[PDB]
Amino acid sequence: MNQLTAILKQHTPMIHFQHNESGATLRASEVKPLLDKFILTKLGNGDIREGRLYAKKNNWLIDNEKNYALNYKLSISLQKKSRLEYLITSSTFPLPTERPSNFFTIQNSPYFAQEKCV
């Protein structure tokens, strides 16, 4: 058809640099390029060039000569904005007891940047 709607389930928290916005969610500006590369690779059976030729055929390309981009629109929307925020550090630090309801901590995590927050 024209529209493809999918509902996603989050398994691990996402480190988002635009957390200040209420509606902040997974940005399509990462998913769409990665999705394009994945779809082209699977179209060519492990060869992105054969997949790009296949997508040049059937006119599935915005940019027949230039890019890897396919002709579709990606929109990622939050249905309900109950955000569950996390603090991630690579060091073990004592946990306080004065927090908002949606503040949780992950300690001794691989994410080592932002270690000066404690």
Add this chain to the structure above:
RNA sequence: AUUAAGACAUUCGUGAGUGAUUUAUUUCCAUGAAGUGGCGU
């Protein structure tokens, strides 16, 4: 003193009336705010 003399092709008259430089045309396409720990062996 002679088939002569006399007589403005002149008067009046607005190059004018009606008339959108307008119909149509996406400042768009592309792109991961992301990479990485180390000593304390």
